[PDB]
RNA sequence: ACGGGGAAUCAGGGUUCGAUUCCGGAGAGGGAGCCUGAGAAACGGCUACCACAUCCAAGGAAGGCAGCAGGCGCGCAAAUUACCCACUCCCGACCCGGGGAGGUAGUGACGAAAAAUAACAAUACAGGACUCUUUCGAGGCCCUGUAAUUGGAAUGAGUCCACUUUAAAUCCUUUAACGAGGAUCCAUUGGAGGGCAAGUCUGGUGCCAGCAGCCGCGGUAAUUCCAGCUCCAAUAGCGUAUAUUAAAGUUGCUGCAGUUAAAAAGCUCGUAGUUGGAUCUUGGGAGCGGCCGU
């Protein structure tokens, strides 16, 4: 602190109050703009409907094709490219399927090789994509 | 070898009864039925078994000992007077109506629809 | 290379081996005992360096 | 609005680094020595000691001959002494900090049932507790956490009801004796 | 954003949460007006309007679950159209009636507590005490560990008579009888390049498929993908996404920084704000312990 007056409580509090806005992690949480522009509307997960299956070219170094899924969210009507996890799990996603969709892990930031894809597909037609991959549940059709 | 030591013994002249916490030793065999404890407490306190009401037994873990609460009234005319109706009914000397509260309430709300003597002609 | 057509390529084309028959692993304190026996009661002071449990150099 | 308690608290804390080799292999040294079943049984003891050891730190800040300290301190000392962890010779609360996890593991029923020699191992001891063969002052104790009061140590023996005592002989013997007379004819 | 008592985290300071069982407030689809009464601007009262919606012989009538269940819808997201006034209390003219208030079961891995999933011996074996031997080897009186080796002794998961429980039941506790060798009465969940505990093993793929919080792995000896064996970690739980706390001395009062890493106004005056020099009583009187103490 740069005012050690005994009667300086408000300058020290009112400075700190003003300088907390220059923090990212604070400015984000304490404005509507981060919580509005969030496609999930501040929710953890979100059910949406697959409208196409999309190949996304991996980043500069490594070079695969990352199989993601273009999603119309129910609650918002908003557009999302959400990644599909492990080997050969895009074979489990028929078009126009209700998929439960979570974040990727970095609180709405793009992960690894996948440019501007912040989401993974968790369940497809209310059946878990780990259970389909392990073959425990069979896809109800 | 089923033994009964009584405990917290108290004489309520204002409900006309003895009351005591009943410690029952029964090592080897099960929780002994209330009837047997009632007969075994009658011969203990020099009374008839009919004016005794002995309930709420919780057998200690391991099970060589249980604890219930007991009452010995002076007369059956006192017993039947100042005893809760469910604990009389366990001795087969009280009967309550079979009709559930769902029937009584649907009757009550149908009886409010009609006024006067028509209130009798709800249940047939 | 590889469009949407190559999905589940490598998962498909592995010689699918069925699991071996195991005497089932003991669970609870029977296991923690067995772990304690593998480490602190049996083994000897070794020349140079002590090896890892899964070690197969 | 209901007549329920709700009051409940954790009895352990998970350690900050989940893979300290030095900790992982000192807590398995504890589990082997004293025949516990998971690291929760160790973090449970460590947490009780840490709460005791927190309360002690709190009383040593206070001035000597403080009424709250003298009352609270003696109350803590007579408790640790009563369970056989600390000594009557050493009941002074700067010794409470010089006190560790083996002192509490020694007083749990599993280890007393073993170190009285009416069990064959620490793992056999849990079996004898779990299978309700042992008692403490005519009370059959199912549970090996049971910390033994210092006065209540000598009254650990078999149950009167168990076949190890003068009890009704068990299921396997009685079936093998009935099969033995079904085998003889 | 109902407030608070409080909750989480936590060296010391803090930060975040508090719709949520106690207190106080507010509202009964939205506004508004009022009757009765001690007490209401009441909604399980009434009167309109607005919105919505029911019945209709089309003239009319009836409605208010943010009470208990239950239904639709909305969603990532939340249970039975159960039994009971016996407990707790409340209401009434009332020892007697009534109470979806409340209690009891049902659903319930929100979460918390305890705590099974084997123990013990005889053997093969191996490592470590000893007489002894250069080495081998001998003995096992002593130990300790592993083999779907064998052997009885165990006790409850379950099955289940009875009592107990209780308004009547249930569960628990007690207790006849059954109830275990692959103890098949079968422990998962995630990992095994580094951070980070644990394979430079084998088979497949060949910058593909995929993994990968980050750094990275994948183009023909892949420690990272897909599997097998193996090993590790937590364990009846374990992973994931998101808010949030510590870690963050990366919001800094404690406690940060500002020549060059981000940063001192171009410079000065200047009012509120903040901070502000030194100085105003001391010596002894009374008493104790061994010059100093109360």
mmCIF file of N, CA and C in Angstrom, chain B:
data_model
loop_
_atom_site.group_PDB
_atom_site.id
_atom_site.type_symbol
_atom_site.label_atom_id
_atom_site.label_comp_id
_atom_site.label_asym_id
_atom_site.label_seq_id
_atom_site.Cartn_x
_atom_site.Cartn_y
_atom_site.Cartn_z
ATOM 1 N N UNK B 1 -33.938 -68.988 32.288
ATOM 2 C CA UNK B 1 -33.020 -68.061 33.035
ATOM 3 C C UNK B 1 -33.333 -66.587 32.721
ATOM 4 N N UNK B 2 -34.480 -66.290 32.098
ATOM 5 C CA UNK B 2 -34.882 -64.913 31.680
ATOM 6 C C UNK B 2 -35.177 -64.106 32.949
ATOM 7 N N UNK B 3 -34.323 -63.127 33.264
ATOM 8 C CA UNK B 3 -34.379 -62.301 34.501
ATOM 9 C C UNK B 3 -34.906 -60.904 34.153
ATOM 10 N N UNK B 4 -35.604 -60.259 35.095
ATOM 11 C CA UNK B 4 -36.078 -58.844 34.992
ATOM 12 C C UNK B 4 -35.683 -58.098 36.270
ATOM 13 N N UNK B 5 -34.723 -57.176 36.156
ATOM 14 C CA UNK B 5 -34.463 -56.101 37.148
ATOM 15 C C UNK B 5 -35.145 -54.825 36.647
ATOM 16 N N UNK B 6 -35.917 -54.158 37.506
ATOM 17 C CA UNK B 6 -36.571 -52.858 37.210
ATOM 18 C C UNK B 6 -35.684 -51.722 37.720
ATOM 19 N N UNK B 7 -35.970 -50.505 37.260
ATOM 20 C CA UNK B 7 -35.075 -49.329 37.369
ATOM 21 C C UNK B 7 -35.905 -48.059 37.152
ATOM 22 N N UNK B 8 -35.455 -46.930 37.705
ATOM 23 C CA UNK B 8 -36.152 -45.616 37.629
ATOM 24 C C UNK B 8 -37.623 -45.813 38.020
ATOM 25 N N UNK B 9 -37.852 -46.553 39.112
ATOM 26 C CA UNK B 9 -39.188 -46.906 39.660
ATOM 27 C C UNK B 9 -39.816 -45.647 40.271
ATOM 28 N N UNK B 10 -41.071 -45.366 39.903
ATOM 29 C CA UNK B 10 -41.824 -44.150 40.309
ATOM 30 C C UNK B 10 -43.309 -44.505 40.427
ATOM 31 N N UNK B 11 -43.978 -43.995 41.469
ATOM 32 C CA UNK B 11 -45.418 -44.227 41.782
ATOM 33 C C UNK B 11 -46.201 -42.938 41.508
ATOM 34 N N UNK B 12 -46.870 -42.860 40.351
ATOM 35 C CA UNK B 12 -47.722 -41.709 39.951
ATOM 36 C C UNK B 12 -49.124 -41.914 40.530
ATOM 37 N N UNK B 13 -49.412 -41.264 41.660
ATOM 38 C CA UNK B 13 -50.758 -41.247 42.291
ATOM 39 C C UNK B 13 -51.739 -40.464 41.406
ATOM 40 N N UNK B 14 -51.231 -39.651 40.468
ATOM 41 C CA UNK B 14 -52.026 -38.721 39.615
ATOM 42 C C UNK B 14 -52.335 -39.352 38.243
ATOM 43 N N UNK B 15 -51.765 -40.524 37.932
ATOM 44 C CA UNK B 15 -52.266 -41.453 36.878
ATOM 45 C C UNK B 15 -52.645 -42.810 37.488
ATOM 46 N N UNK B 16 -52.530 -42.961 38.814
ATOM 47 C CA UNK B 16 -52.877 -44.187 39.581
ATOM 48 C C UNK B 16 -52.099 -45.372 38.998
ATOM 49 N N UNK B 17 -50.763 -45.307 39.043
ATOM 50 C CA UNK B 17 -49.869 -46.346 38.464
ATOM 51 C C UNK B 17 -48.470 -46.293 39.090
ATOM 52 N N UNK B 18 -47.794 -47.445 39.098
ATOM 53 C CA UNK B 18 -46.313 -47.564 39.134
ATOM 54 C C UNK B 18 -45.803 -47.415 37.696
ATOM 55 N N UNK B 19 -44.622 -46.814 37.514
ATOM 56 C CA UNK B 19 -43.880 -46.804 36.222
ATOM 57 C C UNK B 19 -42.390 -47.001 36.510
ATOM 58 N N UNK B 20 -41.704 -47.756 35.648
ATOM 59 C CA UNK B 20 -40.283 -48.156 35.822
ATOM 60 C C UNK B 20 -39.691 -48.551 34.466
ATOM 61 N N UNK B 21 -38.396 -48.296 34.281
ATOM 62 C CA UNK B 21 -37.600 -48.783 33.117
ATOM 63 C C UNK B 21 -37.218 -50.238 33.408
ATOM 64 N N UNK B 22 -37.533 -51.149 32.481
ATOM 65 C CA UNK B 22 -37.428 -52.630 32.655
ATOM 66 C C UNK B 22 -36.173 -53.133 31.933
ATOM 67 N N UNK B 23 -35.139 -53.510 32.695
ATOM 68 C CA UNK B 23 -33.904 -54.177 32.198
ATOM 69 C C UNK B 23 -34.120 -55.696 32.229
ATOM 70 N N UNK B 24 -34.191 -56.329 31.055
ATOM 71 C CA UNK B 24 -34.453 -57.790 30.877
ATOM 72 C C UNK B 24 -33.156 -58.458 30.410
ATOM 73 N N UNK B 25 -32.618 -59.391 31.206
ATOM 74 C CA UNK B 25 -31.463 -60.261 30.841
ATOM 75 C C UNK B 25 -31.991 -61.550 30.202
ATOM 76 N N UNK B 26 -31.569 -61.855 28.969
ATOM 77 C CA UNK B 26 -32.037 -63.029 28.180
ATOM 78 C C UNK B 26 -30.897 -63.617 27.351
ATOM 79 N N UNK B 27 -29.729 -63.922 27.962
ATOM 80 C CA UNK B 27 -28.558 -64.354 27.200
ATOM 81 C C UNK B 27 -28.736 -65.765 26.621
ATOM 82 N N UNK B 28 -28.456 -65.921 25.325
ATOM 83 C CA UNK B 28 -28.563 -67.199 24.598
ATOM 84 C C UNK B 28 -29.727 -67.203 23.624
ATOM 85 N N UNK B 29 -30.897 -66.716 24.051
ATOM 86 C CA UNK B 29 -32.153 -66.738 23.249
ATOM 87 C C UNK B 29 -32.605 -65.303 22.942
ATOM 88 N N UNK B 30 -33.662 -65.178 22.129
ATOM 89 C CA UNK B 30 -34.120 -63.934 21.462
ATOM 90 C C UNK B 30 -34.702 -62.947 22.479
ATOM 91 N N UNK B 31 -35.085 -61.758 22.001
ATOM 92 C CA UNK B 31 -35.961 -60.807 22.731
ATOM 93 C C UNK B 31 -37.230 -61.572 23.115
ATOM 94 N N UNK B 32 -37.464 -61.747 24.416
ATOM 95 C CA UNK B 32 -38.630 -62.510 24.949
ATOM 96 C C UNK B 32 -39.879 -61.654 24.767
ATOM 97 N N UNK B 33 -41.018 -62.242 24.332
ATOM 98 C CA UNK B 33 -42.218 -61.463 24.032
ATOM 99 C C UNK B 33 -42.768 -60.740 25.269
ATOM 100 N N UNK B 34 -43.477 -59.637 25.025
ATOM 101 C CA UNK B 34 -43.980 -58.689 26.056
ATOM 102 C C UNK B 34 -44.889 -59.433 27.038
ATOM 103 N N UNK B 35 -45.702 -60.373 26.538
ATOM 104 C CA UNK B 35 -46.618 -61.235 27.336
ATOM 105 C C UNK B 35 -45.833 -61.905 28.469
ATOM 106 N N UNK B 36 -44.698 -62.536 28.145
ATOM 107 C CA UNK B 36 -43.850 -63.299 29.104
ATOM 108 C C UNK B 36 -43.287 -62.350 30.167
ATOM 109 N N UNK B 37 -42.753 -61.201 29.745
ATOM 110 C CA UNK B 37 -42.230 -60.129 30.647
ATOM 111 C C UNK B 37 -43.378 -59.628 31.535
ATOM 112 N N UNK B 38 -44.584 -59.480 30.974
ATOM 113 C CA UNK B 38 -45.800 -59.004 31.695
ATOM 114 C C UNK B 38 -46.165 -60.007 32.801
ATOM 115 N N UNK B 39 -46.139 -61.310 32.494
ATOM 116 C CA UNK B 39 -46.391 -62.416 33.462
ATOM 117 C C UNK B 39 -45.258 -62.476 34.492
ATOM 118 N N UNK B 40 -44.016 -62.269 34.051
ATOM 119 C CA UNK B 40 -42.797 -62.371 34.896
ATOM 120 C C UNK B 40 -42.675 -61.141 35.811
ATOM 121 N N UNK B 41 -43.291 -60.015 35.431
ATOM 122 C CA UNK B 41 -43.332 -58.757 36.230
ATOM 123 C C UNK B 41 -44.529 -58.785 37.193
ATOM 124 N N UNK B 42 -45.605 -59.498 36.832
ATOM 125 C CA UNK B 42 -46.815 -59.694 37.667
ATOM 126 C C UNK B 42 -46.441 -60.466 38.938
ATOM 127 N N UNK B 43 -45.732 -61.591 38.785
ATOM 128 C CA UNK B 43 -45.296 -62.462 39.911
ATOM 129 C C UNK B 43 -44.193 -61.759 40.720
ATOM 130 N N UNK B 44 -43.486 -60.791 40.124
ATOM 131 C CA UNK B 44 -42.444 -59.971 40.804
ATOM 132 C C UNK B 44 -43.110 -58.997 41.787
ATOM 133 N N UNK B 45 -44.124 -58.240 41.344
ATOM 134 C CA UNK B 45 -44.715 -57.089 42.083
ATOM 135 C C UNK B 45 -46.089 -57.433 42.683
ATOM 136 N N UNK B 46 -46.453 -58.723 42.741
ATOM 137 C CA UNK B 46 -47.641 -59.252 43.474
ATOM 138 C C UNK B 46 -48.917 -58.559 42.969
ATOM 139 N N UNK B 47 -49.176 -58.646 41.662
ATOM 140 C CA UNK B 47 -50.354 -58.047 40.977
ATOM 141 C C UNK B 47 -50.879 -58.996 39.895
ATOM 142 N N UNK B 48 -52.040 -58.666 39.324
ATOM 143 C CA UNK B 48 -52.624 -59.339 38.136
ATOM 144 C C UNK B 48 -51.850 -58.878 36.902
ATOM 145 N N UNK B 49 -51.681 -59.732 35.861
ATOM 146 C CA UNK B 49 -51.001 -59.322 34.628
ATOM 147 C C UNK B 49 -51.789 -58.350 33.728
ATOM 148 N N UNK B 50 -53.071 -58.112 34.030
ATOM 149 C CA UNK B 50 -54.018 -57.359 33.164
ATOM 150 C C UNK B 50 -53.783 -55.846 33.296
ATOM 151 N N UNK B 51 -53.325 -55.374 34.465
ATOM 152 C CA UNK B 51 -53.124 -53.924 34.784
ATOM 153 C C UNK B 51 -51.669 -53.504 34.510
ATOM 154 N N UNK B 52 -50.874 -54.360 33.860
ATOM 155 C CA UNK B 52 -49.446 -54.105 33.504
ATOM 156 C C UNK B 52 -49.390 -53.766 32.009
ATOM 157 N N UNK B 53 -48.627 -52.735 31.624
ATOM 158 C CA UNK B 53 -48.400 -52.314 30.213
ATOM 159 C C UNK B 53 -46.907 -52.038 30.006
ATOM 160 N N UNK B 54 -46.247 -52.909 29.241
ATOM 161 C CA UNK B 54 -44.762 -53.016 29.151
ATOM 162 C C UNK B 54 -44.379 -52.986 27.670
ATOM 163 N N UNK B 55 -43.801 -51.866 27.220
ATOM 164 C CA UNK B 55 -43.634 -51.503 25.788
ATOM 165 C C UNK B 55 -42.220 -50.974 25.508
ATOM 166 N N UNK B 56 -41.936 -50.747 24.218
ATOM 167 C CA UNK B 56 -40.783 -49.984 23.698
ATOM 168 C C UNK B 56 -39.445 -50.611 24.044
ATOM 169 N N UNK B 57 -39.222 -51.868 23.648
ATOM 170 C CA UNK B 57 -37.985 -52.637 23.954
ATOM 171 C C UNK B 57 -36.936 -52.425 22.863
ATOM 172 N N UNK B 58 -35.727 -52.038 23.273
ATOM 173 C CA UNK B 58 -34.541 -51.884 22.394
ATOM 174 C C UNK B 58 -33.430 -52.779 22.943
ATOM 175 N N UNK B 59 -33.209 -53.929 22.299
ATOM 176 C CA UNK B 59 -32.142 -54.899 22.660
ATOM 177 C C UNK B 59 -30.782 -54.275 22.330
ATOM 178 N N UNK B 60 -29.893 -54.184 23.323
ATOM 179 C CA UNK B 60 -28.487 -53.721 23.166
ATOM 180 C C UNK B 60 -27.766 -54.659 22.193
ATOM 181 N N UNK B 61 -26.873 -54.117 21.362
ATOM 182 C CA UNK B 61 -26.042 -54.889 20.403
ATOM 183 C C UNK B 61 -25.236 -55.944 21.173
ATOM 184 N N UNK B 62 -25.087 -57.143 20.597
ATOM 185 C CA UNK B 62 -24.487 -58.322 21.251
ATOM 186 C C UNK B 62 -25.571 -59.238 21.792
ATOM 187 N N UNK B 63 -26.456 -58.689 22.629
ATOM 188 C CA UNK B 63 -27.798 -59.241 22.901
ATOM 189 C C UNK B 63 -27.822 -60.260 24.021
ATOM 190 N N UNK B 64 -27.363 -59.872 25.213
ATOM 191 C CA UNK B 64 -27.605 -60.591 26.478
ATOM 192 C C UNK B 64 -28.445 -59.756 27.427
ATOM 193 N N UNK B 65 -29.088 -58.708 26.899
ATOM 194 C CA UNK B 65 -29.756 -57.631 27.676
ATOM 195 C C UNK B 65 -30.588 -56.765 26.724
ATOM 196 N N UNK B 66 -31.826 -56.444 27.112
ATOM 197 C CA UNK B 66 -32.695 -55.425 26.458
ATOM 198 C C UNK B 66 -33.242 -54.477 27.530
ATOM 199 N N UNK B 67 -33.832 -53.364 27.093
ATOM 200 C CA UNK B 67 -34.460 -52.337 27.963
ATOM 201 C C UNK B 67 -35.777 -51.886 27.324
ATOM 202 N N UNK B 68 -36.888 -52.073 28.041
ATOM 203 C CA UNK B 68 -38.202 -51.470 27.750
ATOM 204 C C UNK B 68 -38.645 -50.575 28.894
ATOM 205 N N UNK B 69 -39.759 -49.861 28.717
ATOM 206 C CA UNK B 69 -40.444 -49.080 29.779
ATOM 207 C C UNK B 69 -41.705 -49.839 30.203
ATOM 208 N N UNK B 70 -42.052 -49.776 31.493
ATOM 209 C CA UNK B 70 -43.182 -50.514 32.094
ATOM 210 C C UNK B 70 -44.091 -49.624 32.918
ATOM 211 N N UNK B 71 -45.376 -49.987 32.997
ATOM 212 C CA UNK B 71 -46.393 -49.362 33.883
ATOM 213 C C UNK B 71 -47.220 -50.470 34.541
ATOM 214 N N UNK B 72 -47.487 -50.345 35.844
ATOM 215 C CA UNK B 72 -48.455 -51.194 36.602
ATOM 216 C C UNK B 72 -49.511 -50.257 37.195
ATOM 217 N N UNK B 73 -50.742 -50.323 36.681
ATOM 218 C CA UNK B 73 -51.915 -49.568 37.192
ATOM 219 C C UNK B 73 -52.492 -50.277 38.422
ATOM 220 N N UNK B 74 -53.397 -49.591 39.125
ATOM 221 C CA UNK B 74 -54.061 -50.078 40.364
ATOM 222 C C UNK B 74 -55.236 -50.985 39.977
ATOM 223 N N UNK B 75 -56.086 -50.525 39.052
ATOM 224 C CA UNK B 75 -57.264 -51.259 38.515
ATOM 225 C C UNK B 75 -57.293 -51.151 36.986
ATOM 226 N N UNK B 76 -58.038 -52.045 36.330
ATOM 227 C CA UNK B 76 -58.292 -52.008 34.862
ATOM 228 C C UNK B 76 -59.162 -50.795 34.512
ATOM 229 N N UNK B 77 -59.979 -50.322 35.461
ATOM 230 C CA UNK B 77 -60.862 -49.133 35.308
ATOM 231 C C UNK B 77 -60.004 -47.866 35.193
ATOM 232 N N UNK B 78 -58.837 -47.838 35.849
ATOM 233 C CA UNK B 78 -57.799 -46.782 35.706
ATOM 234 C C UNK B 78 -57.019 -47.004 34.406
ATOM 235 N N UNK B 79 -56.512 -48.222 34.192
ATOM 236 C CA UNK B 79 -55.775 -48.630 32.972
ATOM 237 C C UNK B 79 -56.543 -48.164 31.731
ATOM 238 N N UNK B 80 -57.783 -48.642 31.553
ATOM 239 C CA UNK B 80 -58.667 -48.325 30.394
ATOM 240 C C UNK B 80 -58.947 -46.815 30.324
ATOM 241 N N UNK B 81 -58.986 -46.122 31.468
ATOM 242 C CA UNK B 81 -59.219 -44.653 31.558
ATOM 243 C C UNK B 81 -58.015 -43.898 30.981
ATOM 244 N N UNK B 82 -56.844 -44.008 31.623
ATOM 245 C CA UNK B 82 -55.672 -43.116 31.397
ATOM 246 C C UNK B 82 -54.498 -43.914 30.804
ATOM 247 N N UNK B 83 -54.745 -44.597 29.680
ATOM 248 C CA UNK B 83 -53.727 -45.278 28.830
ATOM 249 C C UNK B 83 -53.994 -44.911 27.372
ATOM 250 N N UNK B 84 -52.957 -44.656 26.535
ATOM 251 C CA UNK B 84 -53.165 -44.429 25.101
ATOM 252 C C UNK B 84 -53.787 -45.647 24.394
ATOM 253 N N UNK B 85 -54.705 -45.380 23.457
ATOM 254 C CA UNK B 85 -55.682 -46.357 22.904
ATOM 255 C C UNK B 85 -54.968 -47.489 22.158
ATOM 256 N N UNK B 86 -53.853 -47.193 21.488
ATOM 257 C CA UNK B 86 -53.064 -48.177 20.695
ATOM 258 C C UNK B 86 -52.456 -49.256 21.601
ATOM 259 N N UNK B 87 -52.048 -48.898 22.826
ATOM 260 C CA UNK B 87 -51.358 -49.822 23.769
ATOM 261 C C UNK B 87 -52.392 -50.689 24.504
ATOM 262 N N UNK B 88 -53.632 -50.209 24.663
ATOM 263 C CA UNK B 88 -54.792 -51.040 25.098
ATOM 264 C C UNK B 88 -55.089 -52.088 24.017
ATOM 265 N N UNK B 89 -55.089 -51.669 22.746
ATOM 266 C CA UNK B 89 -55.438 -52.485 21.555
ATOM 267 C C UNK B 89 -54.460 -53.655 21.374
ATOM 268 N N UNK B 90 -53.221 -53.529 21.861
ATOM 269 C CA UNK B 90 -52.204 -54.619 21.853
ATOM 270 C C UNK B 90 -52.629 -55.750 22.805
ATOM 271 N N UNK B 91 -53.405 -55.442 23.855
ATOM 272 C CA UNK B 91 -53.949 -56.420 24.842
ATOM 273 C C UNK B 91 -55.335 -56.920 24.411
ATOM 274 N N UNK B 92 -55.791 -56.547 23.208
ATOM 275 C CA UNK B 92 -57.027 -57.048 22.577
ATOM 276 C C UNK B 92 -58.282 -56.627 23.324
ATOM 277 N N UNK B 93 -58.268 -55.455 23.973
ATOM 278 C CA UNK B 93 -59.422 -54.915 24.745
ATOM 279 C C UNK B 93 -59.821 -53.524 24.222
ATOM 280 N N UNK B 94 -59.464 -53.206 22.971
ATOM 281 C CA UNK B 94 -59.945 -52.014 22.217
ATOM 282 C C UNK B 94 -59.906 -52.317 20.711
ATOM 283 N N UNK B 95 -60.924 -51.851 19.978
ATOM 284 C CA UNK B 95 -61.038 -51.946 18.496
ATOM 285 C C UNK B 95 -61.318 -50.552 17.930
ATOM 286 N N UNK B 96 -60.544 -50.128 16.924
ATOM 287 C CA UNK B 96 -60.785 -48.877 16.152
ATOM 288 C C UNK B 96 -61.392 -49.246 14.792
ATOM 289 N N UNK B 97 -62.140 -48.311 14.194
ATOM 290 C CA UNK B 97 -62.796 -48.455 12.865
ATOM 291 C C UNK B 97 -61.733 -48.741 11.792
ATOM 292 N N UNK B 98 -62.068 -49.604 10.829
ATOM 293 C CA UNK B 98 -61.176 -50.012 9.709
ATOM 294 C C UNK B 98 -61.019 -48.871 8.690
ATOM 295 N N UNK B 99 -61.969 -47.922 8.635
ATOM 296 C CA UNK B 99 -62.069 -46.863 7.587
ATOM 297 C C UNK B 99 -60.834 -45.954 7.643
ATOM 298 N N UNK B 100 -60.053 -45.911 6.555
ATOM 299 C CA UNK B 100 -58.842 -45.061 6.396
ATOM 300 C C UNK B 100 -59.247 -43.584 6.331
ATOM 301 N N UNK B 101 -58.287 -42.687 6.563
ATOM 302 C CA UNK B 101 -58.505 -41.214 6.619
ATOM 303 C C UNK B 101 -58.827 -40.659 5.225
ATOM 304 N N UNK B 102 -58.457 -41.368 4.154
ATOM 305 C CA UNK B 102 -58.794 -40.989 2.754
ATOM 306 C C UNK B 102 -60.310 -41.082 2.543
ATOM 307 N N UNK B 103 -60.957 -42.098 3.124
ATOM 308 C CA UNK B 103 -62.428 -42.313 3.046
ATOM 309 C C UNK B 103 -63.145 -41.238 3.867
ATOM 310 N N UNK B 104 -62.719 -41.048 5.121
ATOM 311 C CA UNK B 104 -63.305 -40.081 6.094
ATOM 312 C C UNK B 104 -63.260 -38.650 5.537
ATOM 313 N N UNK B 105 -62.194 -38.298 4.806
ATOM 314 C CA UNK B 105 -61.976 -36.943 4.224
ATOM 315 C C UNK B 105 -62.861 -36.751 2.987
ATOM 316 N N UNK B 106 -62.935 -37.760 2.113
ATOM 317 C CA UNK B 106 -63.803 -37.745 0.901
ATOM 318 C C UNK B 106 -65.270 -37.714 1.340
ATOM 319 N N UNK B 107 -65.625 -38.439 2.405
ATOM 320 C CA UNK B 107 -66.961 -38.345 3.057
ATOM 321 C C UNK B 107 -67.186 -36.900 3.528
ATOM 322 N N UNK B 108 -66.235 -36.342 4.288
ATOM 323 C CA UNK B 108 -66.317 -34.989 4.909
ATOM 324 C C UNK B 108 -66.556 -33.918 3.838
ATOM 325 N N UNK B 109 -65.859 -34.008 2.700
ATOM 326 C CA UNK B 109 -65.913 -33.004 1.600
ATOM 327 C C UNK B 109 -67.174 -33.204 0.751
ATOM 328 N N UNK B 110 -67.692 -34.432 0.657
ATOM 329 C CA UNK B 110 -69.010 -34.724 0.027
ATOM 330 C C UNK B 110 -70.133 -34.188 0.929
ATOM 331 N N UNK B 111 -70.006 -34.356 2.252
ATOM 332 C CA UNK B 111 -71.003 -33.906 3.265
ATOM 333 C C UNK B 111 -71.142 -32.377 3.245
ATOM 334 N N UNK B 112 -70.109 -31.637 2.826
ATOM 335 C CA UNK B 112 -70.143 -30.151 2.749
ATOM 336 C C UNK B 112 -70.924 -29.687 1.509
ATOM 337 N N UNK B 113 -71.029 -30.520 0.465
ATOM 338 C CA UNK B 113 -71.756 -30.197 -0.798
ATOM 339 C C UNK B 113 -73.255 -30.028 -0.516
ATOM 340 N N UNK B 114 -73.821 -30.880 0.346
ATOM 341 C CA UNK B 114 -75.275 -30.905 0.688
ATOM 342 C C UNK B 114 -75.469 -30.242 2.055
ATOM 343 N N UNK B 115 -76.653 -29.668 2.290
ATOM 344 C CA UNK B 115 -77.028 -28.968 3.549
ATOM 345 C C UNK B 115 -78.181 -29.721 4.223
ATOM 346 N N UNK B 116 -78.205 -29.718 5.559
ATOM 347 C CA UNK B 116 -79.288 -30.298 6.374
ATOM 348 C C UNK B 116 -79.213 -31.815 6.451
ATOM 349 N N UNK B 117 -80.375 -32.476 6.465
ATOM 350 C CA UNK B 117 -80.541 -33.932 6.727
ATOM 351 C C UNK B 117 -79.980 -34.762 5.558
ATOM 352 N N UNK B 118 -79.825 -34.164 4.368
ATOM 353 C CA UNK B 118 -79.204 -34.787 3.171
ATOM 354 C C UNK B 118 -77.750 -35.199 3.449
ATOM 355 N N UNK B 119 -77.089 -34.587 4.444
ATOM 356 C CA UNK B 119 -75.699 -34.911 4.883
ATOM 357 C C UNK B 119 -75.584 -36.370 5.360
ATOM 358 N N UNK B 120 -76.685 -36.983 5.809
ATOM 359 C CA UNK B 120 -76.754 -38.404 6.233
ATOM 360 C C UNK B 120 -76.670 -39.348 5.020
ATOM 361 N N UNK B 121 -77.223 -38.942 3.867
ATOM 362 C CA UNK B 121 -77.334 -39.764 2.627
ATOM 363 C C UNK B 121 -76.136 -39.487 1.703
ATOM 364 N N UNK B 122 -74.915 -39.559 2.242
ATOM 365 C CA UNK B 122 -73.628 -39.373 1.505
ATOM 366 C C UNK B 122 -72.972 -40.752 1.346
ATOM 367 N N UNK B 123 -72.802 -41.472 2.462
ATOM 368 C CA UNK B 123 -72.410 -42.895 2.506
ATOM 369 C C UNK B 123 -73.638 -43.792 2.474
ATOM 370 N N UNK B 124 -74.215 -43.985 1.281
ATOM 371 C CA UNK B 124 -75.507 -44.666 1.015
ATOM 372 C C UNK B 124 -76.652 -43.888 1.676
#
